[PDB]
Amino acid sequence: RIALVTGGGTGVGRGIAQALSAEGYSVVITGRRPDVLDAAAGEIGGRTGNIVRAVVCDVGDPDQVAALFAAVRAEFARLDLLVNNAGSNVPPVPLEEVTFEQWNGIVAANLTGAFLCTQHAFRMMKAQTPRGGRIINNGSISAQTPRPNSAPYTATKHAITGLTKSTALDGRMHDIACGQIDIGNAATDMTARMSTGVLQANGEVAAEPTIPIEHIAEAVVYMASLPLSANVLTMTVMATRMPLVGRG
Amino acid sequence: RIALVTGGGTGVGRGIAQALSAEGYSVVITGRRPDVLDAAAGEIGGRTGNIVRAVVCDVGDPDQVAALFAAVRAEFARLDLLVNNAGSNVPPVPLEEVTFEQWNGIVAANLTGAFLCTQHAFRMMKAQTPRGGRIINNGSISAQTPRPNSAPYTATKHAITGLTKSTALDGRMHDIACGQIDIGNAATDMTARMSTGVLQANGEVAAEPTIPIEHIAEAVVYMASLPLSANVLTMTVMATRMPLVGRG
Amino acid sequence: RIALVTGGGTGVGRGIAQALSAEGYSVVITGRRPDVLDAAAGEIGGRTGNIVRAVVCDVGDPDQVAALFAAVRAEFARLDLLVNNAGSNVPPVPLEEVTFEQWNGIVAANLTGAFLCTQHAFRMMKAQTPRGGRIINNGSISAQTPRPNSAPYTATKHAITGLTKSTALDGRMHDIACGQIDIGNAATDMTARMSTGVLQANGEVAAEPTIPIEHIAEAVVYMASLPLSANVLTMTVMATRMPLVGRG
Amino acid sequence: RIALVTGGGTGVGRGIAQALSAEGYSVVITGRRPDVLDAAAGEIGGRTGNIVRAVVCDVGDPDQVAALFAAVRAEFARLDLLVNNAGSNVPPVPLEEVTFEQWNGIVAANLTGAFLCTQHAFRMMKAQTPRGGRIINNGSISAQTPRPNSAPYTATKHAITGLTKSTALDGRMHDIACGQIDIGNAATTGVLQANGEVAAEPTIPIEHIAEAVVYMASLPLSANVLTMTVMATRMPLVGRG
């Protein structure tokens, strides 16, 4: 099975790529930093003995995205699983202080990118035989309830839910499944913004609990392990003790 | 670890119970049909080789649920996992023709039982040591979007979403996690091969695609396997090509 | 036009009944206490010069609900609007201390009543010429996000959302429109000035910002002003500054 | 009271502007077509006797957006109400056939414009005295449930839900309220059903949408319609597709 994980050189993406590789998949990963990507491909293929190709790619750029998918096709002929994971955040700055440059950055990375990757996945999954495949979109807890000072991130994540639905709907008759995982506070280490301090509903900065990245990878492996006729349309996996379920 | 699965003698409940047993849990299942319950317990018990107990119990009855929980406490002293699976649908009938008996019946089976068991899980989990546990509510995609002639069913399943939400909020400080699985057309092979017709949005009757019960049991196993600090707040697992994600 | 407002002798329901009457509806309000209900009807009819009829009734009781609707048919021969407003919020107690009596009462008040009335509205609205009419369900902010120690109320209000969806679906072909209003901290000037403490997400007690009942009343008048072919499917009207939209 | 309606020259926006102008608001409308915009402002103004200004302005352009709000501040010194109504759709072409231009254009129209106007509204409303004001976001039924071949539209409208929540949250302590209206089949023949078939659907007069917006804005800042869905009753939505 062929898998493509955008933003798979670092963090959650990497742990997903790693777990996917251990399960047998051939895995392509994308990122913008060749050293990081090269490194991760080497370590993961290292451990698993299975194929790991690294393509440097800006998913906001349509030519680069188109090139990425033409390379994947040229080497593997088909694509069985796409994990749309590339993203980014804005500093928690006041809403009216977000620069145009920051705004464009997050729309491209968090929404446009996931959209261009879906298009190319559709074109490949429709054409290949057997037809079909799965697309899993990395969402966020921000697809449900915002932190203060997070309009852009919160918009782009909400937009991903929309994308997931339309994709789930348009792909139905084509044996293409689409599902979304909303992630709550997954972190490799205390270097992450959750341990470093994130805004609470009252506008204060505080540290929040996190969950090992390993659990998310596990979850995604389960979503992808399903036959095309089953689908995890949405799932929320989170640090249990982080604020979310109460009023803020 | 000790697990309790209501309505675990049949269907989704049985598959969940079996999977949990194969995972090494000591499993306790409930139901109203003694033969069927024993049979189930015996079979699972055999294949896995672990303690699978069967208690005949009407989870809509406070006295029975009390006994149910007193039994569990007396044998195992603790409870790590409660799966609220007991529940039943209803043959569709025009909204105004639903009898009081039917309404009351479907409220007790789909809501009250799950509430009563949650109550007792909480009391056990808050008092046991180590303290804490996980509660998984079986909801339904009717918690999202109804079939025609299903007000009572749709209401109780929406009500489960709220129950999960409150249980999750109230349990947060006690290491008690709760999450909901919304299932879309899971069926045993025999039941699915029946091609039972169901009401579409336009009122027509037609059979729908289904998925194996195993995939739901795998998902519940995953949910349950996380440490207490992690939680699947919700997840929709479904037959990919059944109607739902588009407009009805 | 004929309108029926359950629990319309007091609070939000009384305010709605007042505004509808002011709009030239004939209004039937229901409630458990005769003196209260009678006074309200007379007070309202006074200001507007329109018929306000007070029926002392427990909408959780099937027989009573039947007499109620029979009394409505016998006098006005039609029903054009049903506002399911009767309900109640238990004073907050730990999840596991909620008595069976409390549970049955809140489920009967907050969900059963609305269903039974909706059943009879259907009956009448399908029979009359020309057919149709509107149903407005009083949901809650708790249909979205719970306060701590409120699983029963949160569950019954979530349930109303299910009810509304199925009602809207089933009524479609009969020119019956269903919509729901989720109210956030609406209060009488009397009740509001008391500064009553309520539970926050963290378990602290504090008074919260409120809004005049008059605004909910105005909202319902708008919902009902639409021809049957248009519908406010849902609206949330709330105190702008009360906690809700951020994480708790 | 000073109101600003983006895309107020035509369709739903123009209805909202008309209704607001009738309630006694001074109104500013925006659009890219000066001829249409000028004429709509004249029609409305002549009907109500109230000030209606037309600013030619593409909301996806941060300079034009800044210049627009500077003109509002210049004449009125304040803004009480922003209605983010501007927006567009993309032909029901299959998902992989949508062009990059079509994508960029709907993103700019439906999400970026709303965000940019929101920014400037915040700046003004936090500075003016009395401070605060209200922002009403025109969302869509597509923020709940998609038609086939509508990923870009469905995503951007879902994004509006995110924007609304964050605005409501960040605005709370500055006497800024923000709510969203999801419209179903405003009249402005056949559209795509869940099964891919083309069929026509019930609609609702612009007049009822405008009424709903007028209701939302009639509230004092301490009250807010956080979201509402106003729709043609008998259109598919609440059932499975």
Residue A20 dihedral angles phi and psi, to the nearest 5°: -60, -45
Q: What is the SS3 assignment for B33?
A: coil
Q: Would you call A95 and D170 a contact, using CB atoms and an 8 Å cutoff?
A: yes
- For B151, the closest of C120, C123, C167 (CB atoms) is C167
For residue A91, the tally of other CB atoms under 10 A from its CB is 9
Q: List the single residue in D147, D148, D241 with the smallest CB-CB distance to B201.
A: D241
Strand partners, D140: none
**CA distance linking residue C106 with residue C154, whole number of Å:** 10
Is there a contact between C236 and D228 if contact means CB atoms under 8 Å apart?
yes
* C-alpha separations of D134 from A163, C131, C191, D224 in Å: 29, 40, 27, 9
Other Cβ atoms within 10 Å of C6 Cβ, number = 26
Is A153 in contact with A143 (CB distance < 8 Å)? no
Closest chain D residue to the Cα of C219, Cα to Cα: D215
Residue D217: which of D19, D8, D10 has the closest Cα? D19
The answer to whether the bond into C130 is cis (omega within 30° of 0) is yes
- D202: buried, middle or exposed (CB in 10 Å: 19+, 13-18, 0-12)? middle
Main-chain dihedrals φ then ψ at residue B221, nearest 5 degrees: -55, -45
CATH number for the domain running over B1-248: 3.40.50.720
Q: How many C-beta atoms surround the C-beta of residue D36 within 10 A?
A: 15
**Residue B12: CB partners within 8 Å, gap ≥ 6?**
B85, B138, B183, B186, B213, B216, B217
Q: Classify the C-alpha dihedral D205-D207-D208-D209 as positive or negative.
A: positive
- Please report residues of C whose CB lies closer than 8 A to that of A243: 201, 247-248
State the Cα angle at D160 between A162 and C178, rounded to 5°.
80
Q: Is A7 on the interface with C (CB under 8 A)?
A: no
B106 touches chain A (CB under 8 A): no
Q: Are B32 and B60 in contact (CB under 8 A)?
A: no
- Contact by Cβ (8 Å): D200, D191: yes
Of D195, D104, D183, D136, residue with least CA distance to D17: D136
DSSP structure class, residue A243: S
Which string of DSSP letters, residue by residue, matches C166-181?
HHHHHHGGGTEEEEEE
Say whether the peptide bond before residue D202 is cis (omega within 30 degrees of 0): no
Q: Report the residue of D93, D116, D145, D154 to disrupt the A interface, i.e. the one with the largest count of A CBs within 10 Å.
A: D154
Instruction: Assess contact for B142 and C162: CB atoms under 8 A.
Output: yes
Look at residue C148 and give its three-state secondary structure. Answer: coil
Beta partners for residue C10, in sequence order: none
- Cα(D43)–Cα(B214) distance, integer angstroms: 65
Q: Which residues of D touch C168 (CB under 8 A)?
A: 238
Distances in Å between the Cα of B85 and the Cα atoms of B17, B196, B215, B230, C94 are 10, 22, 15, 21, 23
Residue whose C-alpha is closest to residue B233's, from B171, B173, B184: B171
* DSSP label of D146: P
Indicate left, alpha or beta for C24 from its phi (over 0: left) and psi (-120 to 50: alpha): left
Peptide bond into D130 cis (omega under 30): yes
Q: At what angle do helices C151-171 and C113-127 cross, to 10 degrees?
A: 10
Residue type, D42: G
Q: Could you tell me the CA-to-CA distances from C13 to B208, C65, C85, C121, D151 in Å, in that order?
A: 43, 17, 6, 18, 42
Q: Identify any residues that bridge with B102 across adjacent strands, giving them in sequence order.
A: none
Q: How far apart are CA B61 and CA B109, in angstroms?
A: 10
3 state SS for D64-97: HHHHHHHHHHHHHCCCCEEEECCCCCCCCCCHHH
d(CA B246, CA B237): 17
**Do the Cβ atoms of D214 and D160 come closer than 8 Å?**
no
CA distance A175 to A93: 42
D234: contact with C, CB 8 A cutoff? yes
Per CB-CB distance under 8 Å, the chain C contacts of A201 are: 243, 246-248
Superfamily of domain D1-241: NAD(P)-binding Rossmann-like Domain (3.40.50.720)
Main-chain dihedrals φ then ψ at residue A221, nearest 5 degrees: -55, -40
The answer to whether B247 contacts chain A (CB < 8 Å) is no
Asked if C66 and C120 touch (Cβ cutoff 8 Å), the reply is yes
Beta strands in C186-244 (DSSP E): 198-199, 205-206, 230-239
Determine the residue type at C91. P
Question: Coil, strand, or helix at residue D199?
Answer: strand
Chain center to CA of B224: 13
Residue D6, exposed/middle/buried by CB under 10 A (0-12, 13-18, 19+)?
Answer: buried
Question: Where is A117: in which H helix or E strand?
Answer: helix A113-127
Cross-strand pairs, D135? D82, D178
Task: List the one residue out of C95, C111, C90 whose CA is nearest residue C198.
Answer: C90
Task: Tell me how many degrees the CA angle A72-A158-A103 measures, rounded to the nearest 5.
Answer: 80
Q: C213-225 and D206-218 are packed helices; what angle lies between their axes, rounded to 10 degrees?
A: 180
**Are D91 and D101 a contacting pair, CB within 8 Å?**
no
Q: Is there a contact between D50 and D80 (Cβ–Cβ < 8 Å)?
A: no
What are the structure tokens assigned to A228, written together? 């095309």
Answer whether C236's CB lies under 8 Å from C244's CB.
Answer: no
Q: Which of B12, B153, B168, B187 is catalytic?
A: B153
Residues of chain C in contact with residue B166, where contact means CB-CB under 8 angstroms, are 95, 146, 150-151, 154-155
Q: What share of chain C is helix, strand, coil (3-state, %, to 5)?
A: 50, 20, 30
Chain D residues close to C236, C-beta within 8 Å? 225-228
Helix, strand counts (H, E) of chain B: 8, 11
Cis amide prior to D62 (ω within 30 degrees):
no
> Considering only CA atoms, which of B87, B4, B13, B12 is closest in space to residue B53?
B4
Q: Which residues 138-197 of C are in CB contact (within 8 Å) with B?
A: 142-143, 145-146, 148-152, 154-163, 165-167, 169-170, 173
Q: How many helices (H) and strands (E) does chain C have?
A: 8, 9
Tokens of D122: 């915040």
Give the residue from chain A lying closest to C201, CA to CA: A246
Interatomic CA distance for residues C25 and C27, integer angstroms: 6
Tell me if C181 sits within 8 A of B201, measured CB to CB. no
Q: Give the strand pairing for B197-199 and B205-207.
A: antiparallel
d(CA C230, CA C223): 9
Using CB atoms within 10 Å of the CB of residue C129, give its burial: 0 to 12 exposed, 13 to 18 middle, 19+ buried: exposed
Residue B18 belongs to what H/E stretch?
helix B11-22
CA distances from residue C214 to C13, C120, C186, C228, D209 in whole angstroms, order as listed: 11, 28, 9, 24, 21
**Token match 């739903």: residue?**
D12
What is the resolution in angstroms? 2.5
Tokens 């004449």 belong to residue: D75
Catalytic: C25?
no
Which residues is A3 bridged to in the sheet? A27, A81
Contact D194 B148 (CB under 8 A): no
Residues of A in contact with C184 (CB under 8 A): none
Whether the CA torsion A15, A19, A20, A25 is positive or negative: it is positive
Calpha distance B147→B129 (Å, rounded): 44
What is the separation, in whole angstroms, between the first and last Cα of chain D?
44
Q: Which helix (DSSP H) or strand (DSSP E) does residue C5 occupy?
A: strand C2-5
Chain B residue with minimum CA distance to D184: B247
Question: Within 13 Å, how many C-alpha atoms sit on residue B188's CB side?
Answer: 10
Per-position b or e across B148-187, b if 16+ CB within 10 A of its CB: bbbbbbbbbbbbbbbbbbbbbbbbbeebbbbbbbbbbbbb
C60 within 8 A of C31, measured Cβ to Cβ:
no
Residues in chain A: 248
Q: Torsion angle of alpha carbons D228, D230, D233, D236, nearest 10°?
A: -80
Tally of CB atoms within 10 A around B92: 18
Q: What 3-state class would DSSP assign to C38?
A: helix
Cα–Cα distance between B195 and B179 in angstroms, integer? 31
Cα–Cα distances (Å) from C95 to A246, B8, B87, B136, in that order, read 15, 25, 21, 16
- Residue B214 sits at the vertex; the CA angle it makes with B211 and B215, to the nearest 5 degrees, is 60
Please give the Cα distance from A59 to A112 (Å, whole number): 8
Contact D232, C229 (CB under 8 A): yes
> Using CA atoms, how far apart are residues D205 and D227, in angstroms rounded to an integer?
20
Instruction: List all chains that touch chain C, counting a touch as 3 or more CB pairs closer than 8 Å.
Output: A, B, D
- Burial state string for A183-202 with b = 16 or more CB within 10 A and e = fewer than 16: bbbbbeeeebbbeeebbbbe
> Alpha-carbon distance B216 to B237, whole Å?
7
- Residue type present at position C55: V
User: Nearest CA of chain B to the CA of A35: how many Å?
Assistant: 32
Rounded distance, CA D139 to CA C14, Å?
32
